From a paper:
The intensely sweet taste of thaumatin has been widely used not only as a natural sweetener, but also as a flavor enhancer and for masking unpleasant tastes in the food and pharmaceutical industries. Site-directed mutagenesis studies revealed that six lysine residues of Lys19, Lys49, Lys67, Lys106, Lys163, and Lys187, and three arginine residues of Arg76, Arg79, and Arg82 located on the cleft-containing side are responsible for sweetness, and two amino acids residues, Lys67 and Arg82, are particularly important for sweetness. In the present study, three mutant X-ray crystallographic structures of thaumatin (K78A, K106A, and K137A) were determined at resolutions of 1.07, 1.07 and 1.01 Å, respectively.
The threshold values of sweetness of K49A, K106A, and K163A were 140, 140, and 180 nM, respectively, which is about a 3.1- to 4-fold reduction of sweetness. The structure consists of 3,267 protein atoms including hydrogen atoms, 20 tartrate atoms, 18 glycerol atoms and 300 water molecules. The normalized B-factor ratio of Ala106 was 0.68 for main-chain and 0.72 for side-chain and those of Lys106 in recombinant thaumatin for main-chain and side-chain were 0.61 and 1.25, respectively. The normalized B-factor ratio decreased by 0.53 for side-chain, suggesting that the flexibility of side-chain was also reduced. With K106A thaumatin, the volume of positive charge from lysine residue was reduced but the distribution of charge was relatively small when compared to K78A and K137A. Compared to Lys78 and Lys137, Lys106 is not relatively exposed to the molecular surface. As to Lys106, it was 5.0 Å from CG of Asp173_T1R2, which also interacted with Arg82 in the length of 4.6 Å. Since the interaction to Asp173_T1R2 still is retained, substantial reduction of sweetness might not be induced by K106A.
Residue numbers in the entry: 1 to 207
Write the structure that this text describes.
């Protein structure tokens, strides 16, 4: 499957793509404002994620740091990123269909549209100004809006027991972005797409 990753933000981002135990494609790349990077994701990828990273530095070997979304200091991510990270999430070719969502469960850093480029389903978007409106206790000094699990490490926010409800913090994310997951047990906003669809992830879609 092809994913075109487009940075419409006025700032550089470092895109990242991983399924947690491996890179997807090269796993990461710099995207200056306006740049597009097309990746190939193997059919059948389950639990893949794409995100943006901000305020990164890398040496000539591809090691460094990012202020949001840092994946073990690598340019070319093999693991998931450090919150806060707005997440484009997908599982492809799962019994004949693809499943896509946006999640704020690991916080928010950059606004996002995640849409098919092929027929048969709709996209999802989280493009509100969550960083600007972020509750004071959730603001990440390194940049972004943390989720409450990251900040407070409770069973209720992290949904550790499989039993949790919405919270004042989840409700903030949900109010700004109804179409994205706000906590683990949120009413799902997953879209079912034809199997083997192709996609576009746009950072700062309303930029």
């Amino acid at each position: 499957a092809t994913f075109e990753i487009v940075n419409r933000c006025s700032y550089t981002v470092w895109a990242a793509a991983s399924k947690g135990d491996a890179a997807l494609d090269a796993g990461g790349r710099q995207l200056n404002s306006g740049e597009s990077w097309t990746i190939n994701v193997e059919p059948g990828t389950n639990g893949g994620k794409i995100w943006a990273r901000t305020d990164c530095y890398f040496d000539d070997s591809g090691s460094g740091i990012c202020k949001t979304g840092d994946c073990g200091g690598l340019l070319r991510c093999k693991r998931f990123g450090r919150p806060p990270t707005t997440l484009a999430e997908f599982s492809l070719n799962q019994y004949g269909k693809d499943y896509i969502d946006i999640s704020n469960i690991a916080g928010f850093n950059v606004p996002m549209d995640f849409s098919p480029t092929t027929r048969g389903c709709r996209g999802v978007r989280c493009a509100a100004d969550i960083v600007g409106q972020c509750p004071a206790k959730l603001k990440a000094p390194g940049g972004g809006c943390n989720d409450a699990c990251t900040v407070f490490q409770t069973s209720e926010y992290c949904c550790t027991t499989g039993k949790c409800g919405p919270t004042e913090y989840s409700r903030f994310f949900k109010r700004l972005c109804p179409d994205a997951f706000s906590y683990v047990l949120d009413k799902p906003t997953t879209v079912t797409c034809p199997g083997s669809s192709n996609y576009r992830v746009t950072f700062c879609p309303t930029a």
